[PDB]
mmCIF file of C-alpha atoms and ligand atoms in Angstrom:
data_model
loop_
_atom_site.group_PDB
_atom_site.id
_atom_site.type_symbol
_atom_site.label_atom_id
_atom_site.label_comp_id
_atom_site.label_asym_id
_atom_site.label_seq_id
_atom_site.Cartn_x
_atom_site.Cartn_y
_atom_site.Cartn_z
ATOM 1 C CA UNK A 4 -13.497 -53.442 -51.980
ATOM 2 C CA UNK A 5 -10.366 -51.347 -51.947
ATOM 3 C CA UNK A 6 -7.704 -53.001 -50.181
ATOM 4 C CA UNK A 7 -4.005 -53.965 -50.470
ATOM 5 C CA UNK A 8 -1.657 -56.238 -49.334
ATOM 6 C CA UNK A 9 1.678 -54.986 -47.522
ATOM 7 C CA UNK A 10 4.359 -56.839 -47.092
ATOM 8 C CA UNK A 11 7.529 -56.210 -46.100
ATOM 9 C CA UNK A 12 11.144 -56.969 -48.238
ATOM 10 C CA UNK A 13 12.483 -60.567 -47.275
ATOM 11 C CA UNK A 14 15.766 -59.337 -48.044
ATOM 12 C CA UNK A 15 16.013 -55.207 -47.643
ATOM 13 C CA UNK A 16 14.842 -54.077 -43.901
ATOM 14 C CA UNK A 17 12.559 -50.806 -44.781
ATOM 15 C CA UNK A 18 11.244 -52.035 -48.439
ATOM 16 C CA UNK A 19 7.565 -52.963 -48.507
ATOM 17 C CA UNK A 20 5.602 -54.663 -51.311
ATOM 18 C CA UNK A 21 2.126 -53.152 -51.703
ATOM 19 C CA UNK A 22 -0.202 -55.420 -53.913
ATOM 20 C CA UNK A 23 -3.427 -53.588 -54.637
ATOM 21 C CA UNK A 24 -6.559 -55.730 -55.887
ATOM 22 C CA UNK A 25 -8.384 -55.294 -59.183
ATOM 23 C CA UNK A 26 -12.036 -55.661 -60.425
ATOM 24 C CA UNK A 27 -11.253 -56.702 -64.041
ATOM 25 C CA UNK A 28 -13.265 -57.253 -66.713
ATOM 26 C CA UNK A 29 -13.187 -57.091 -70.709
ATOM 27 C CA UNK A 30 -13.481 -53.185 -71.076
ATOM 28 C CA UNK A 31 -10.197 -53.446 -68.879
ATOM 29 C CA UNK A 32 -9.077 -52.875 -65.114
ATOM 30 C CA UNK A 33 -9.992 -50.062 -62.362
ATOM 31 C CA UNK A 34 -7.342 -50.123 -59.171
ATOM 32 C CA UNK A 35 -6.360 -47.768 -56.143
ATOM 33 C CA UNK A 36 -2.732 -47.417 -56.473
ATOM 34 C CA UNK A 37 -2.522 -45.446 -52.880
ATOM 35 C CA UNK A 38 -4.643 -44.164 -49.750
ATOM 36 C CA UNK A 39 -2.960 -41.937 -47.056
ATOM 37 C CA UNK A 40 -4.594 -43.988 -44.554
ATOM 38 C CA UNK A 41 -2.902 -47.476 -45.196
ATOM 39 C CA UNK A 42 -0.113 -46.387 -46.726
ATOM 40 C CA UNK A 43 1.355 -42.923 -45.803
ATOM 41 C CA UNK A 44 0.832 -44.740 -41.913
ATOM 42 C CA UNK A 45 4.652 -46.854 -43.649
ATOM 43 C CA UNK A 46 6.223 -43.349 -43.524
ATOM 44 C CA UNK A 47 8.397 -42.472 -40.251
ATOM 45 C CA UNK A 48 6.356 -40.215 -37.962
ATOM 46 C CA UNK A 49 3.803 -37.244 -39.683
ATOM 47 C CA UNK A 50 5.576 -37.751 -43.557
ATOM 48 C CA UNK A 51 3.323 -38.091 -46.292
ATOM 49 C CA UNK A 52 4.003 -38.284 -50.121
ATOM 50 C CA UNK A 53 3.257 -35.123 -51.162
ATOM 51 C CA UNK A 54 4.544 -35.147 -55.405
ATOM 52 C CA UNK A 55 3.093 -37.659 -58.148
ATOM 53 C CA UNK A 56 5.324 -38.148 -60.977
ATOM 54 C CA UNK A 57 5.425 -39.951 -64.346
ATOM 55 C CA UNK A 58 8.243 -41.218 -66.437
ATOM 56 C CA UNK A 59 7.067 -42.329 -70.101
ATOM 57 C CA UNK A 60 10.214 -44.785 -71.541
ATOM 58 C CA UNK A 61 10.635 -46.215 -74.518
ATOM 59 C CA UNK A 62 11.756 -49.945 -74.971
ATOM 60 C CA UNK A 63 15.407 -50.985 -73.384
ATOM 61 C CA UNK A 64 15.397 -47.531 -71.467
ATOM 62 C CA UNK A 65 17.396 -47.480 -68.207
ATOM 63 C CA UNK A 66 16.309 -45.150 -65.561
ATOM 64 C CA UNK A 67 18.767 -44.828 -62.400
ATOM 65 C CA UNK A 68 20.625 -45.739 -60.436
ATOM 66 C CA UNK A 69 18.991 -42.680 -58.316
ATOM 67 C CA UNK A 70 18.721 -41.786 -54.592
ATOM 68 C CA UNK A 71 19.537 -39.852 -51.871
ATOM 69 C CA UNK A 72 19.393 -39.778 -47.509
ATOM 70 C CA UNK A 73 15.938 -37.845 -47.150
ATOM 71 C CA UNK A 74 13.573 -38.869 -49.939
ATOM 72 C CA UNK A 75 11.175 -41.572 -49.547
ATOM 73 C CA UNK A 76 9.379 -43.094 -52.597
ATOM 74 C CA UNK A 77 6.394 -45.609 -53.757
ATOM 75 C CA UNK A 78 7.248 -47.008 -57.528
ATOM 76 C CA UNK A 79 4.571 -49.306 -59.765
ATOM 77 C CA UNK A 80 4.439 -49.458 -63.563
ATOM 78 C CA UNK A 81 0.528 -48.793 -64.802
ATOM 79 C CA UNK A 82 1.253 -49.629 -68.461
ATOM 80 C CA UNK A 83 4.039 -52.418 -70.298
ATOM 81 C CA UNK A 84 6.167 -53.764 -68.221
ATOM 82 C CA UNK A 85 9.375 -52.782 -66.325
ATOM 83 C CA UNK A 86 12.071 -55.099 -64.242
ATOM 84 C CA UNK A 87 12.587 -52.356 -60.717
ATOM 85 C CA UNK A 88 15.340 -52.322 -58.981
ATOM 86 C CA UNK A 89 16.288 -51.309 -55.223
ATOM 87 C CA UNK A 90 19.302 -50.633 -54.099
ATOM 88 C CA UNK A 91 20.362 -50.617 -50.209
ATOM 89 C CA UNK A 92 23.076 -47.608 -50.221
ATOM 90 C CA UNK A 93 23.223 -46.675 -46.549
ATOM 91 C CA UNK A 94 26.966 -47.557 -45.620
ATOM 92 C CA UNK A 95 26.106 -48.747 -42.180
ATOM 93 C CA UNK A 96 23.517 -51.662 -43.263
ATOM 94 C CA UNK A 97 24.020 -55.404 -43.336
ATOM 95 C CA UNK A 98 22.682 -55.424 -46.767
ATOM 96 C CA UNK A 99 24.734 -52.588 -47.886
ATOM 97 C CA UNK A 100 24.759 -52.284 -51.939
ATOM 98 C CA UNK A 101 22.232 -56.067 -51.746
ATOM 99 C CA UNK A 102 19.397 -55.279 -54.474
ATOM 100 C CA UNK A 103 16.207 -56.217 -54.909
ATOM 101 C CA UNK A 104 14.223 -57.012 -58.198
ATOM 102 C CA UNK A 105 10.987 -57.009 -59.453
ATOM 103 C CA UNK A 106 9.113 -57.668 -62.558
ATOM 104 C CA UNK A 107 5.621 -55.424 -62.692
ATOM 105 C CA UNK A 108 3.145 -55.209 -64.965
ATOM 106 C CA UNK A 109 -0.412 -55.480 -65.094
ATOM 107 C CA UNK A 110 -0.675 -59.171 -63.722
ATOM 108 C CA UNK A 111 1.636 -58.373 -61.327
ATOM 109 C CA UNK A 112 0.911 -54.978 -59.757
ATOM 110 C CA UNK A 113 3.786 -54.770 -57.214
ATOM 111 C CA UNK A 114 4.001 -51.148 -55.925
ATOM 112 C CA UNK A 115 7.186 -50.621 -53.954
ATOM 113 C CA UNK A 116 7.942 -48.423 -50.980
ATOM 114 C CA UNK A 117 11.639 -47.360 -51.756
ATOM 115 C CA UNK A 118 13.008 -45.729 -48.335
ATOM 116 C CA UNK A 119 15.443 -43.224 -47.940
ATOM 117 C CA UNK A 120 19.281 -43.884 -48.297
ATOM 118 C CA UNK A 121 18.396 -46.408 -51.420
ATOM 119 C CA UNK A 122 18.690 -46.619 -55.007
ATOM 120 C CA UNK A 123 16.128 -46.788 -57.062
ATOM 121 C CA UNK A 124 16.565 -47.810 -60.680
ATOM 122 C CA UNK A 125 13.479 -49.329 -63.474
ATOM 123 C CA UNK A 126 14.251 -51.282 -66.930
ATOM 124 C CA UNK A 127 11.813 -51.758 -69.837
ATOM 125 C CA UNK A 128 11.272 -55.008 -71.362
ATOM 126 C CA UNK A 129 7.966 -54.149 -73.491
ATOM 127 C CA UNK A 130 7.197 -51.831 -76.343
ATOM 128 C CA UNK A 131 6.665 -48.567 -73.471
ATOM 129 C CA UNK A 132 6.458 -48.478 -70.038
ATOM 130 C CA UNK A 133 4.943 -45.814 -68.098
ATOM 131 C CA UNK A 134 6.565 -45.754 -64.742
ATOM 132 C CA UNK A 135 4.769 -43.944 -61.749
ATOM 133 C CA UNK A 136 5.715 -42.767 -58.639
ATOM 134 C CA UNK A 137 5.160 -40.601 -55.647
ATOM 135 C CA UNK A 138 7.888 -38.786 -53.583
ATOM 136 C CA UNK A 139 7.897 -38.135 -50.008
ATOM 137 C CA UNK A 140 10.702 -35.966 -48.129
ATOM 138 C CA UNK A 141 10.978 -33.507 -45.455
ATOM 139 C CA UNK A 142 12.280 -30.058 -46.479
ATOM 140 C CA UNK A 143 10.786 -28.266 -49.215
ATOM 141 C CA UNK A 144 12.776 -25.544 -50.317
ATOM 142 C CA UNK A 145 16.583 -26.940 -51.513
ATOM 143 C CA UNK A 150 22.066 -37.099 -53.504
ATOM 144 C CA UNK A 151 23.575 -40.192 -55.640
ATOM 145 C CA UNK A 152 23.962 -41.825 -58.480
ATOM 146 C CA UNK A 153 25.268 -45.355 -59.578
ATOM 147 C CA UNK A 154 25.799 -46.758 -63.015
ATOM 148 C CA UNK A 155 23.526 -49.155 -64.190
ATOM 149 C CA UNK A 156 25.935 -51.806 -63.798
ATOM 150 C CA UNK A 157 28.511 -51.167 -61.575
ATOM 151 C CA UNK A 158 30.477 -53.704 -60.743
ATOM 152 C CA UNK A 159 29.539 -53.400 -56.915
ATOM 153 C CA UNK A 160 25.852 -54.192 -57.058
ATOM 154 C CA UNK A 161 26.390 -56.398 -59.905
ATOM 155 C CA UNK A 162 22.668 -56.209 -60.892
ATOM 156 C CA UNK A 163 21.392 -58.581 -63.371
ATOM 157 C CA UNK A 164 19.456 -56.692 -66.316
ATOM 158 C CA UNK A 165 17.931 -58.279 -68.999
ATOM 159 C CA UNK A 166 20.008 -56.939 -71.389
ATOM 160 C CA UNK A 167 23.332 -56.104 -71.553
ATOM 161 C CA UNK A 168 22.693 -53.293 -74.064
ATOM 162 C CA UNK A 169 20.346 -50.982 -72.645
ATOM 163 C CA UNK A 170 19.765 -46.854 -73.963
ATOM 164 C CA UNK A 171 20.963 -44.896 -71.443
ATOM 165 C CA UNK A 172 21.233 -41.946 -73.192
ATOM 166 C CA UNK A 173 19.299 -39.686 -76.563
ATOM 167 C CA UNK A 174 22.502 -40.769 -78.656
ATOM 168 C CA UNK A 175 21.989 -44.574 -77.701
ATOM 169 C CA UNK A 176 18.069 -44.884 -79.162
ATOM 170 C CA UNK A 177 19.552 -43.683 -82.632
ATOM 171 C CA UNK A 178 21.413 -46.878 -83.016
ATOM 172 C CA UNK A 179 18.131 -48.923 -82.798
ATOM 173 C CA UNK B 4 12.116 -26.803 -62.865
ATOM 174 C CA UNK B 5 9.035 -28.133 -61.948
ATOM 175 C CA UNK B 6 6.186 -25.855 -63.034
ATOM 176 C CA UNK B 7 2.240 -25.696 -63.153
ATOM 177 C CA UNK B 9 -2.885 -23.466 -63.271
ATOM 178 C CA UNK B 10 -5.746 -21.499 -65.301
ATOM 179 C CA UNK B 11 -9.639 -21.567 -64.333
ATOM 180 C CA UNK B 12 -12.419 -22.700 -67.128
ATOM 181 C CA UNK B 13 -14.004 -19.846 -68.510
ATOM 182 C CA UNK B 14 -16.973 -21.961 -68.475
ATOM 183 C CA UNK B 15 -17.777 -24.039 -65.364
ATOM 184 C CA UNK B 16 -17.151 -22.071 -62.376
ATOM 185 C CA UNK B 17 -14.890 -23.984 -59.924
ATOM 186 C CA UNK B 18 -13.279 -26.344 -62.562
ATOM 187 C CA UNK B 19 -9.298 -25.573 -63.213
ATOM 188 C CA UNK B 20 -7.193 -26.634 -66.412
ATOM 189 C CA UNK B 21 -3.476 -27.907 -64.995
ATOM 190 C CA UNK B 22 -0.821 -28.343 -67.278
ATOM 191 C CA UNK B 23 2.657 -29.018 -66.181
ATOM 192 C CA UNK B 24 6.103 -28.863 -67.896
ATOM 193 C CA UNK B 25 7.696 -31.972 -69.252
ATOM 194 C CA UNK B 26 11.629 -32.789 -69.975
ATOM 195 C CA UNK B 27 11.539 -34.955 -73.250
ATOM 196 C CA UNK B 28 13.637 -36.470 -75.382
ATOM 197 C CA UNK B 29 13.711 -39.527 -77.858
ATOM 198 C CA UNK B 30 13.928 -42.036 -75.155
ATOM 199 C CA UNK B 31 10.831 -40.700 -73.428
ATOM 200 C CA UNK B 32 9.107 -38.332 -71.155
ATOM 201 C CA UNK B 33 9.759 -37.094 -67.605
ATOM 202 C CA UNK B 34 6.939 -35.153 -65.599
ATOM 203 C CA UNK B 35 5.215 -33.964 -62.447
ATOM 204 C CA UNK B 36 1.021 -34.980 -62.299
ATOM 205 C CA UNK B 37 1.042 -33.151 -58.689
ATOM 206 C CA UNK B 38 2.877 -31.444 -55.529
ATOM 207 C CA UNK B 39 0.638 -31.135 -52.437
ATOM 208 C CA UNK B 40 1.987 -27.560 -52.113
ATOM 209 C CA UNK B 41 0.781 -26.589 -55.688
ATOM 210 C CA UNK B 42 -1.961 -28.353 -56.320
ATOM 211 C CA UNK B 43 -3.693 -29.327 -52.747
ATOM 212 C CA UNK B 44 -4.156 -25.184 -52.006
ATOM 213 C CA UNK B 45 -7.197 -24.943 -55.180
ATOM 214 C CA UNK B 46 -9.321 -27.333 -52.858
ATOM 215 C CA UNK B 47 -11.501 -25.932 -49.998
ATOM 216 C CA UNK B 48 -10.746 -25.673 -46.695
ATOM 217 C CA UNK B 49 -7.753 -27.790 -46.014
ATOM 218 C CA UNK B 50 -9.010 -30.216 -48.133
ATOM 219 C CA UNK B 51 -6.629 -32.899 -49.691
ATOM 220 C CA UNK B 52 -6.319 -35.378 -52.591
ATOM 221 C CA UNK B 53 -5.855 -38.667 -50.485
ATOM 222 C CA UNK B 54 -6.814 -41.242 -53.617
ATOM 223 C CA UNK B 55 -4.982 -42.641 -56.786
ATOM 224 C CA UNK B 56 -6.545 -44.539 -58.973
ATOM 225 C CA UNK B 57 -5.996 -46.014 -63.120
ATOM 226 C CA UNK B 58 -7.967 -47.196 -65.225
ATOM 227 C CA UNK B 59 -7.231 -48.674 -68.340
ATOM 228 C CA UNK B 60 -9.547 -48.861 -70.618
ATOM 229 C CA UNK B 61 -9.674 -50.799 -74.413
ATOM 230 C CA UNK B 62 -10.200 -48.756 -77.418
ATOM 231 C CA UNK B 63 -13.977 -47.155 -77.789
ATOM 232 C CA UNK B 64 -15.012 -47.878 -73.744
ATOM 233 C CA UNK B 65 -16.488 -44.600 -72.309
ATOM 234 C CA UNK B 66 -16.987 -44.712 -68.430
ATOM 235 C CA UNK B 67 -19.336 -41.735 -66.555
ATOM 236 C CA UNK B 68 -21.162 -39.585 -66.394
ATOM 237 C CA UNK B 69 -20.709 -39.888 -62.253
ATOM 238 C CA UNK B 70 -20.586 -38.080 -59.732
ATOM 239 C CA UNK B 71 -21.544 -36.448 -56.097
ATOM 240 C CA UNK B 72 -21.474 -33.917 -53.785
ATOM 241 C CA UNK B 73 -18.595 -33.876 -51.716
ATOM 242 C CA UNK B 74 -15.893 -36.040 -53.864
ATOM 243 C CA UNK B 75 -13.465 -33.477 -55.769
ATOM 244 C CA UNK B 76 -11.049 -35.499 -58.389
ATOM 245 C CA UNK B 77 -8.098 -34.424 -60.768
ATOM 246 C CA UNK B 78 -7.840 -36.433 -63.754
ATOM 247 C CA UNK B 79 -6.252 -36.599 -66.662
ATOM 248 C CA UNK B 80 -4.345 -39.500 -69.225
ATOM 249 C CA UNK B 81 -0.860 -40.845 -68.659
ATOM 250 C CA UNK B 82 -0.853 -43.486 -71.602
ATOM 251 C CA UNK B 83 -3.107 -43.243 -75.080
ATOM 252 C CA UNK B 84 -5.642 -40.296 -75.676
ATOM 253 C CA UNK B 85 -8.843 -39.961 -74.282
ATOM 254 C CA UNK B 86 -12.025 -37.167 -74.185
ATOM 255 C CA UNK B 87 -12.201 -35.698 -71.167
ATOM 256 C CA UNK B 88 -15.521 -34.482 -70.103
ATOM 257 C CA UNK B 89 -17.009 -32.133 -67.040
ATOM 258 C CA UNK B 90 -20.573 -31.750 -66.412
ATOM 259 C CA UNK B 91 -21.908 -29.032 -64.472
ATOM 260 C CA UNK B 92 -24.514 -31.069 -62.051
ATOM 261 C CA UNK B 93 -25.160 -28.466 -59.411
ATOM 262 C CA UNK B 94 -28.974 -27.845 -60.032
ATOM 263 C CA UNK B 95 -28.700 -24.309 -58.555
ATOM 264 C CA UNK B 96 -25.431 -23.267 -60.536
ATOM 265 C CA UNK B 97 -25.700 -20.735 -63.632
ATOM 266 C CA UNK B 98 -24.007 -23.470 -66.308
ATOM 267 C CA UNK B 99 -26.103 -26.001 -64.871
ATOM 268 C CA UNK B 100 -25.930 -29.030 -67.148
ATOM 269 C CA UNK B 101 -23.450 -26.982 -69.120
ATOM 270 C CA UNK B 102 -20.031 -29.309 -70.023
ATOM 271 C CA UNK B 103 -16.333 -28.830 -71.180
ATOM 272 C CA UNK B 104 -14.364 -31.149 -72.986
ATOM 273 C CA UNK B 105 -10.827 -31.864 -73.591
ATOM 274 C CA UNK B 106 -8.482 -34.246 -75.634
ATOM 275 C CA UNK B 107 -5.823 -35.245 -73.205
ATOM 276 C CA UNK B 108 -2.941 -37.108 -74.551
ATOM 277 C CA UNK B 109 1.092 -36.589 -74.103
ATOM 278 C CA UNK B 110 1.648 -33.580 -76.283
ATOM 279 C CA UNK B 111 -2.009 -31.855 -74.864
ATOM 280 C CA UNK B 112 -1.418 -32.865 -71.011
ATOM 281 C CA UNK B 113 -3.996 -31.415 -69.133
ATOM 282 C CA UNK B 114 -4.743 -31.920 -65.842
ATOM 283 C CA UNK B 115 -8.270 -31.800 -65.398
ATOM 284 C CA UNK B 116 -9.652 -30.482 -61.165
ATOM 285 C CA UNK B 117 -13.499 -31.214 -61.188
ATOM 286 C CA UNK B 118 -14.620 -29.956 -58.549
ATOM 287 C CA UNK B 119 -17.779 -31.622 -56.155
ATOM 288 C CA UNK B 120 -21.360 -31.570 -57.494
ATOM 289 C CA UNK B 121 -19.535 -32.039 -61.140
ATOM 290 C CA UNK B 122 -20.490 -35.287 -63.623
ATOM 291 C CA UNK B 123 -17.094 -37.184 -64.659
ATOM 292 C CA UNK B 124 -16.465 -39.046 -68.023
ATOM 293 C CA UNK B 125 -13.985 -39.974 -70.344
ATOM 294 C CA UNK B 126 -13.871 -41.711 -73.594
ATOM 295 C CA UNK B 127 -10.775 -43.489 -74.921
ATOM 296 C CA UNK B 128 -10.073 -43.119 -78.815
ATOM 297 C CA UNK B 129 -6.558 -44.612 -78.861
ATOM 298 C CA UNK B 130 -6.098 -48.475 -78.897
ATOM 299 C CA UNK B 131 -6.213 -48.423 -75.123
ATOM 300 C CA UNK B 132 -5.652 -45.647 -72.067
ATOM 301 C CA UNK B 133 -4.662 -45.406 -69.355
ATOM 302 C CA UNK B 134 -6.789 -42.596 -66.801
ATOM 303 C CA UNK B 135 -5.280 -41.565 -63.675
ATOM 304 C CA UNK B 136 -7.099 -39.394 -61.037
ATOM 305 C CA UNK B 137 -6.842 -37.841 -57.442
ATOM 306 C CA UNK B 138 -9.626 -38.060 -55.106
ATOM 307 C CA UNK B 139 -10.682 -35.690 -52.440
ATOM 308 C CA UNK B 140 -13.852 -36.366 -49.617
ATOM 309 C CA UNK B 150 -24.258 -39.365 -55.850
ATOM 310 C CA UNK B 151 -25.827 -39.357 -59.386
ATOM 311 C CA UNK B 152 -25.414 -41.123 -63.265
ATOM 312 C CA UNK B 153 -25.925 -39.784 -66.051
ATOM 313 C CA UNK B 154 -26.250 -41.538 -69.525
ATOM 314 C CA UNK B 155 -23.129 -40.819 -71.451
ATOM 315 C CA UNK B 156 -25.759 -39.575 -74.618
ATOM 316 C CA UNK B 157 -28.253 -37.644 -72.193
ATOM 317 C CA UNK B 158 -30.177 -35.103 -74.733
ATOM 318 C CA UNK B 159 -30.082 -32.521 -71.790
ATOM 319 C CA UNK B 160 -26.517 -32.437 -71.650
ATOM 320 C CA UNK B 161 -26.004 -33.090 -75.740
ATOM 321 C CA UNK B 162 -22.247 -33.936 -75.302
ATOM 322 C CA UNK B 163 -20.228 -34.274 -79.155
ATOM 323 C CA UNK B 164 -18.541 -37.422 -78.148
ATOM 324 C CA UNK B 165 -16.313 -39.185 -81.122
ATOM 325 C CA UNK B 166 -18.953 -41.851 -81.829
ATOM 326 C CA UNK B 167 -22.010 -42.772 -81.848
ATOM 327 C CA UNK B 168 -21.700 -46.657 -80.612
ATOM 328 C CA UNK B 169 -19.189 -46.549 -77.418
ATOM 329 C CA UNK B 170 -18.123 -49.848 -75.417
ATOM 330 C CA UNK B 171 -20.869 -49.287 -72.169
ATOM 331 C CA UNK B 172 -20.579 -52.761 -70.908
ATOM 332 C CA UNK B 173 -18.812 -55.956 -71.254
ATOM 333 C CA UNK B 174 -21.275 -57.587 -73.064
ATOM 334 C CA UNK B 175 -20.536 -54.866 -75.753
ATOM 335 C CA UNK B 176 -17.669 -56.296 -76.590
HETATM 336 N N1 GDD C 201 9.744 -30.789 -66.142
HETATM 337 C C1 GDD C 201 10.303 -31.761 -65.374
HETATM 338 N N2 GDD C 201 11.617 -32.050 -65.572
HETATM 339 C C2 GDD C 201 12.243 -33.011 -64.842
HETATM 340 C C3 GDD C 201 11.481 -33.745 -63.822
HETATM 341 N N3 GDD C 201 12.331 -34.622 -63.264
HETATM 342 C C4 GDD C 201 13.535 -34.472 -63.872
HETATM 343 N N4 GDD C 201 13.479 -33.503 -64.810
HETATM 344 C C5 GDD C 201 14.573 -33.036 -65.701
HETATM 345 O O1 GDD C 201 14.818 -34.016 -66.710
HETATM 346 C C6 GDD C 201 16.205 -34.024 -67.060
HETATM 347 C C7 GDD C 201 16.737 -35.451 -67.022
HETATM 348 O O2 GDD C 201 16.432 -36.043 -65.763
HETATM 349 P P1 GDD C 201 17.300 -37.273 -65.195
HETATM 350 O O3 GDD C 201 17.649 -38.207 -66.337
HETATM 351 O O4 GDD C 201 16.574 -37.803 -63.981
HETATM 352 O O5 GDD C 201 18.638 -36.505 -64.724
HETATM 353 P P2 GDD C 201 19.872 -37.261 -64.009
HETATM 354 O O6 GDD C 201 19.349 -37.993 -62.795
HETATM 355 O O7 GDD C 201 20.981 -36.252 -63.832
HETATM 356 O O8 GDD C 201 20.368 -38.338 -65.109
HETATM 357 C C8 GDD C 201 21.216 -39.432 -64.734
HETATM 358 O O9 GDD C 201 20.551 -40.691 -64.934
HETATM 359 C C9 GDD C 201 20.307 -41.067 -66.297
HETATM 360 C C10 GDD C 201 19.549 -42.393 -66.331
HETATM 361 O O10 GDD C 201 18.370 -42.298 -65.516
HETATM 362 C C11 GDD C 201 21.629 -41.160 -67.057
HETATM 363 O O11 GDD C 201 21.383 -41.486 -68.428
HETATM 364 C C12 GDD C 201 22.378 -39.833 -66.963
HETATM 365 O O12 GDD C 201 23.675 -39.923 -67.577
HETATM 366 C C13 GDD C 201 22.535 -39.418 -65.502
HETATM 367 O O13 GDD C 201 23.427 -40.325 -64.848
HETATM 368 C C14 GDD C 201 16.924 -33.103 -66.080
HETATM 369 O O14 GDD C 201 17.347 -31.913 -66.753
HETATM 370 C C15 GDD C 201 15.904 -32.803 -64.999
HETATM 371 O O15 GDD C 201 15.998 -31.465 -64.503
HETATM 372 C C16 GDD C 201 10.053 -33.380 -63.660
HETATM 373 O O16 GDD C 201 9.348 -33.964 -62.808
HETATM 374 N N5 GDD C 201 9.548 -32.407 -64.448
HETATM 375 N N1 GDP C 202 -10.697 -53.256 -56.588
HETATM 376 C C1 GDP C 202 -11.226 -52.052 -56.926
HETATM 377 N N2 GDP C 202 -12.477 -52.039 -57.466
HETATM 378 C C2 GDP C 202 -13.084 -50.872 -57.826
HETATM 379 C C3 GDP C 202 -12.359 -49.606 -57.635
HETATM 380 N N3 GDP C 202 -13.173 -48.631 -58.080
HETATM 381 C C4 GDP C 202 -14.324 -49.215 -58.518
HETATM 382 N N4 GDP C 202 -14.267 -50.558 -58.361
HETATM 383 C C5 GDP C 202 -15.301 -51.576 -58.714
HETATM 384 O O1 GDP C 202 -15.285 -51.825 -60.121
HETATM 385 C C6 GDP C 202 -16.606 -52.129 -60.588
HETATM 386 C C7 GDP C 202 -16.922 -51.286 -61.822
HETATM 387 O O2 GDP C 202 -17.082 -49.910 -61.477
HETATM 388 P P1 GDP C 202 -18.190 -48.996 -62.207
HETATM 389 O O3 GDP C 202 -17.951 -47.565 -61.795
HETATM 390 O O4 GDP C 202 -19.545 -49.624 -61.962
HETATM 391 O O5 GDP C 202 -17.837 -49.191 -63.776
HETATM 392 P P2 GDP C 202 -17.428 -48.001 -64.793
HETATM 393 O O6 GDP C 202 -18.589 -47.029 -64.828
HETATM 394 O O7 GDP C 202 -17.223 -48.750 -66.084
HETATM 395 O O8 GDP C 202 -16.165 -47.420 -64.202
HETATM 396 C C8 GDP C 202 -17.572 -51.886 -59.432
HETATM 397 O O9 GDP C 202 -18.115 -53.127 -58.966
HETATM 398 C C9 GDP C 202 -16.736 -51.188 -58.374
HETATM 399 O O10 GDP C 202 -17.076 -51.605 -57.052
HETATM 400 C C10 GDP C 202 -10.993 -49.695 -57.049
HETATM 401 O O11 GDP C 202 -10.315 -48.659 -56.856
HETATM 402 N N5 GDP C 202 -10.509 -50.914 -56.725
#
């Protein structure tokens, strides 16, 4: 019954693509967005995603670009739709500053493992999104971030007008 | 700062979570759960190994369920829904007792029902989405006279063929 498919980035060594299934029906959906066993076993030896957090964005919000060299994470959108972004920022890699994209929402359930030493960055395209996503990191007790579109990455939004900030929204 | 915890002063075992948010006019920012805060109410070691959504359509109630050993957290990340607890440990004090709560994102409570409890939830906005926690087995009728729970309406979504 509860299973998911894992597959790992075609393009960004460490990224996986976890698919869960649904049972679906016209009251709506019910899905298992994470199990320790299949997926904390993606994690480098004895880590475990230990924080669940939720971002609530209005339409053409920006999050990102956000990472840093310690913290894993495991991104999905459970309501709207988003357009998520990964960014390989670990100097020494082939695909140094190479993104990857992907469009999630409910018909495409897409739940990404984000390693550490990448950016991670999520655009909504419908009304809202809620964005969730759990954190894993060693170290308990005590970092970068790239513009949206800097020139580098060169990632291609939907939009070349997006709110980045409280002052921006007041426009629209 | 990332911040939580107060026990029901009804159903013994059952804790009300609420955590700080950042907002601002583009949205909300906030923390459902830390292992190190939240994991340390469960018995034993215990952990919260299990996420899970559901979204639901306007007027669909799902429970009352339940068992034994299975301790959730729960509350509503899009929409507004009832939250409801239901004391089903035959031998407890407020057996058959319940608590309710309207969860929604200026009321975000965080609901830890602990094993040997009844789960349900009724959604009253145009849809919801639920999220809960799991931690490791009986049905109740969502109207059950024993339990008398004030739910919203009187004609909730119970099946597909409903709609
Ligand atoms: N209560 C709570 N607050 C939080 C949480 N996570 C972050 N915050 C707080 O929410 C505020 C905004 O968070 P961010 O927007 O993530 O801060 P930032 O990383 O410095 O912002 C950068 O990215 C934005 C786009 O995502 C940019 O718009 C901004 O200019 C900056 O570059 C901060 O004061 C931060 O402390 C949480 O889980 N809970
Ligand atoms: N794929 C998947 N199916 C699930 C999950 N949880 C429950 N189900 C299935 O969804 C169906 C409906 O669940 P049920 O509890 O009977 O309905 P409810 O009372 O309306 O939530 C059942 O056939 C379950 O086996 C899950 O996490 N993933």
């Amino acid at each position: 019954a509860i299973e998911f498919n894992i597959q790992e980035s075609k393009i960004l060594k460490g990224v996986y693509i976890i698919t869960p299934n649904k049972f679906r029906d016209l009251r709506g959906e019910i899905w298992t967005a994470f199990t320790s066993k299949a997926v904390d076993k993606l994690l480098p030896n004895g880590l475990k995603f230990i924080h669940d957090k939720f971002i609530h964005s209005k339409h053409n919000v920006i999050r990102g670009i956000h990472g840093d060299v310690k913290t894993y994470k495991l991104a999905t959108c459970v309501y709207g739709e988003i357009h998520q972004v990964v960014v390989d920022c670990r100097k020494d890699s082939p695909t140094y500053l190479k993104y990857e994209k992907f469009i999630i929402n409910q018909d495409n359930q897409q739940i990404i493992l984000v390693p550490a030493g990448f950016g991670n960055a999520h655009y909504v395209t419908s009304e809202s999104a809620v964005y969730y996503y759990k954190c894993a990191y060693k170290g308990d007790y005590v970092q970068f971030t790239y513009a949206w579109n800097d020139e580098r990455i060169g990632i291609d939004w939907p939009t070349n007008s997006p709110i980045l900030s409280e002052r921006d929204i007041l426009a629209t």
